[PDB]
């Protein structure tokens with residue numbers, strides 16, 4: 185018999201993104217080639233099958249630095265990290281291939297699905 | 307020119323609640339009288355003006371235990387912690403006074419607003 | 429607020 | 433997915 189506040193989840197994610205932009209309580213650095221991205225492990229896990237697996241591992245859960253596969257493009261990762269914290273995906277003709285490949289690696293099934301749909305249309 | 311995934315924020319919050327239920331990456335214990343509640347500092351901050359102030363403090367940000375004011379009712383806190391992680395508020399005749407008082411203390415303005423509305427109706 |  |  186609960187009541188529900190429709191905007192609560194969106195407001196929580198907006199505040200988590202504000203914490204990220206201000207580098208507050210970030211507990212991990214994701215290294216993608218020469219580029220570094222600070223984030224919250226919990227948000228990464230909530231969005232990605234890959235980060236979920238990494239941070240539930242009894243040894244990796246304690247690492248402050250995670251290095252991604254050298255094939256991963258920093259821009260594709262940046263676009264996906266922004267999506268994790270906002271629900272908004274900056275999908276463009278020039279980045280769609282790198283975004284799909286990064287989403288497949290990160291195990292972000294809904295992003296992979298829309299990339300496959302957008303590629304099929306063109 | 308981004309696209310948006312409507313269910314993303316709700317799915318993120320659902321996964322954060324699953325992490326909470328399994329005690330994964332919880333980094334704080336909230337003590338309310340004899341009762342203890344494990345949670346994620348970032349989620350508490352995203353939902354509460356009080357926790358936002360506590361964990362942005364250069365000294366308190368590093369505490370693993372936070373003791374609430376002894377006037378705070380453990381059931382009211384439990385109901386509010388559940389709301390933080392689900393968007394669902396278990397508001398009942400027998401708990402509304404304790405929920406409103408706890409929400410005022412935690413600075414959860416939308417919960418305070420619905421409690422004031424529900425009390426006014428009766 | 430809604431009835432979910 | 434929608435146009436926000």
Ligand SMILES: O=C1Cc2cc(Nc3cc(Cl)ncc3Cl)ccc2N1
Pocket residue numbers: 229230231232233234236291292293294321322324325
């Ligand atoms: O496409 C995706 C997105 C995703 C997220 C998560 N993260 C969780 C899943 C569960 Cl059941 N509990 C907790 C968490 Cl944080 C796992 C796999 C995938 N695949």
Ligand SMILES: O=C1Cc2cc(Nc3cc(Cl)ncc3Cl)ccc2N1
Pocket residue numbers: 199200202203351352353354355356358413414415416
């Ligand atoms: O009723 C409320 C809910 C709430 C949440 C937060 N948390 C934040 C606010 C901002 Cl601007 N950036 C980041 C965070 Cl985590 C502060 C005050 C209140 N009052």
Ligand SMILES: [Cl-]
Pocket residue numbers: 231292293294295296
């Ligand atoms: Cl996804």
Ligand SMILES: [Cl-]
Pocket residue numbers: 353414415416417418
């Ligand atoms: Cl609220």
